[PDB]
Paper text:
Rab proteins, the biggest subfamily within the superfamily of small GTPases, are major regulators of vesicular trafficking in eukaryotic cells. One such family of effector proteins that was reported to link Rab proteins and the cytoskeleton is the Mical (molecules interacting with CasL) family. In this publication, we present a thorough biochemical and structural analysis of a Rab effector domain termed bivalent Mical/EHBP Rab binding (bMERB) domain.
Stimulated by the evidence for two Rab binding sites in some bMERB domains (Mical-1, Mical-3 and EHBP1L1), we searched for crystallization conditions of these RBDs with Rabs in a 1:2 stoichiometry. Crystallization conditions were found using a complex of Rab101–175 and the RBD of Mical-1 (residues 918–1067), yielding crystals that diffracted to a resolution of 2.8 Angstrom at a synchrotron X-ray source and the resulting structure indeed showed two molecules of Rab10 bound to Mical-1. Whereas one Rab protein binds to α-helix 1 and the first half of α-helix 2 (Mical-1918-991, binding site 1, blue), the second molecule of Rab10 binds the second half of α-helix 2 and α-helix 3 (Mical-1994-1060, binding site 2, green). Upon superimposition of both binding sites, the strong similarity becomes obvious and the helices from both binding sites adopt very similar positions. Upon closer inspection and alignment, a strong similarity between the two Rab binding sites in Mical-1 became obvious, involving the same/similar residues both within the two different molecules of Rab10 as well as the two binding sites in Mical-1, respectively. Consistent with the localization of the two separate binding sites within the N-terminal and the C-terminal half of the bMERB domain, respectively, deletion constructs lacking either α-helix 1 (Mical960–1067) or α-helix 3 (Mical-1918–1020) displayed a clear 1:1 stoichiometry of Rab binding both in aSEC and ITC experiments. Furthermore, the ITC data allowed us to clearly allocate the high affinity binding to the C-terminal binding site and the lower affinity binding to the N-terminal binding site. In summary, the strong conservation of interacting residues between both sites as well as the structural conservation of the binding sites lead us to conclude that this family of Rab binding proteins must have evolved via gene duplication. The work presented constitutes the first description of two Rab proteins binding a single effector domain.
Author numbering:
A (entry chain C): 6 to 146, 150 to 175
B (entry chain B): 918 to 1014, 1026 to 1060
C (entry chain A): 5 to 175
Write the structure that this text describes.
């Protein structure tokens, strides 16, 4: 393979992380909520730009107990995506807190992408596209694991922002 | 536990391939010995020997090498295949969860994450080495 | 089965005993029949270092310089290199500088280098004191061994030491 990119997902417990990763890693979705414990990661080899990229996507467990040790894996993060579910409530209250942590612990040049997940959950949609998308314009940076939409392109985008930092 | 059977199908395709690779490596070793003697006799000139060696023995040597490389890649996938089962057991045990013992099991889980990781990083640095 | 694969490589002038060090290590034997090496090849031997079982793919190079360009071709992947001289032969020991420079030119910067003074059984023909090999080793901050493919002196320990050294910096 040609290169190796190491991404990390950060978020609160109940927003979609292990399911966004699972929909991309294996093109699937499952309803049961199995809380992630500590840390995990999966490997996905992709064929962007003829450069064969190996992805190492790290999955965080966003459960207050763990917030010590998961900090550990921040420095190595090259690219990041932060978990936002359209229907989820006051998971935004803590965004600054996580972003504090990235400023506090990650490498300075780490990329940051923000996702809207579960966008099939329109009925309980609490948060417009631009509700947070204006925040996205604020820092210069939607998907459904259930319906598997814009998930693949979401990750390949982060590959874009990293591999362009390469040259 | 259907996934459990899936792990078998992976493991068994791998084992098959390792026997294929052992085999091909023996055939290549055999030919290689035969060729090198054919060489010794054929010409006295030393650099002529060199030209002849580049001719045939070398390509054989590299076929050998890429065979071994594939073998090692597989033996790493095996390692990941069992590190994962361990991560599964320790996952369960943590779910079920005097006070001090649990932190030990949790840190065993974490350590296993890092052995998987160390494998990934290791093959990254190998890749790097051969690029130069 | 084995956990990891290390690439090792032996360099040194034609005649100092590389093929026979490797043959002692691989098959615990020795021949006085001298067949000079042509080109490059490798032998396989798996080992156990404190619970990690590691496969050593060890490349025997050709010592004569008409193969230099070709053999240097292969320094790229090696995790450890044994430079070898002959204690009875002053020429082999004075050419250690040039061998090391090939390493600098064509190896990874990362690589481990171990220095071997072969044929320590024959003390009567010693032209190089053990302490001069020690000296240069110290000055380059690498390991040194006096070895005998014939007498089975220090072969296994040199190889396992190299493998342990590589292994220690592996994560
Ligand atoms: N409708 C719908 N539900 C989803 C979608 N993605 C996840 N969910 C549901 O939302 C819940 C949260 O998913 P999960 O990824 O496990 O949460 P998490 O953020 O990883 N939590 P933790 O930090 O504990 O690991 C699960 O019950 C899952 O079934 C989606 O795209 N659509
Ligand atoms: N006394 C003694 N003789 C040795 C020892 N090691 C090798 N020899 C002899 O010295 C010669 C060196 O052989 P060889 O191993 O082919 O050296 P080489 O460096 O591989 N030669 P080349 O690079 O040309 O292939 C052989 O004839 C061998 O029998 C040793 O430890 N002690
Ligand atoms: Mg999770
Ligand atoms: Mg030889």
């Amino acid at each position: 393979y040609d290169l190796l990119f190491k991404l990390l997902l950060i978020g609160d417990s109940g927003v979609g992380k292990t399911c966004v990763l699972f929909r991309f890693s294996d093109d699937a979705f499952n309803t049961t909520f199995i809380s992630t414990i500590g840390i995990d990661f999966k490997i996905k080899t992709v064929e962007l730009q003829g450069k064969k990229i190996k992805l190492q996507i790290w999955d965080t467990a966003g459960q207050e107990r763990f917030h010590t040790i998961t900090t550990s894996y921040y420095r190595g993060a090259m690219g990041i995506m932060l978990v936002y579910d359209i229907t989820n409530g006051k998971s935004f209250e803590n965004i600054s807190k996580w972003l504090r942590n990235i400023d506090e612990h990650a490498n300075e040049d780490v990329e940051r992408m923000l996702l809207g997940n579960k966008c099939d959950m329109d009925d309980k949609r609490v948060v417009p596209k631009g509700k947070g998308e204006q925040i996205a314009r604020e820092h210069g940076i939607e998907t459904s694991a259930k319906a598997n939409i814009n998930i693949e392109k979401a990750f390949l985008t982060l590959a874009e922002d990293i591999l362009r930092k390469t040259p | 536990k259907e996934e459990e059977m899936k792990r078998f199908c992976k493991a068994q395709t791998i084992q098959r391939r390792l026997n294929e690779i052992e085999a091909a490596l023996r055939e290549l070793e055999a030919e290689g010995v035969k060729l090198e003697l054919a060489l010794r006799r054929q010409s006295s000139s030393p650099e002529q020997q060199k030209k002849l060696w580049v001719g045939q023995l070398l390509q054989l040597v590299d076929k050998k090498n890429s065979l071994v490389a594939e073998e090692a890649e597989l033996m790493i996938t095996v390692q990941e295949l069992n590190l994962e089962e361990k991560q599964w057991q320790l996952d369960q045990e943590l779910r079920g969860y005097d006070r001090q013992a649990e932190d030990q099991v949790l840190r065993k889980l974490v350590d296993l994450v890092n052995q998987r990781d160390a494998l990934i990083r290791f093959q990254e640095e190998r890749r790097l080495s051969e690029l130069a």
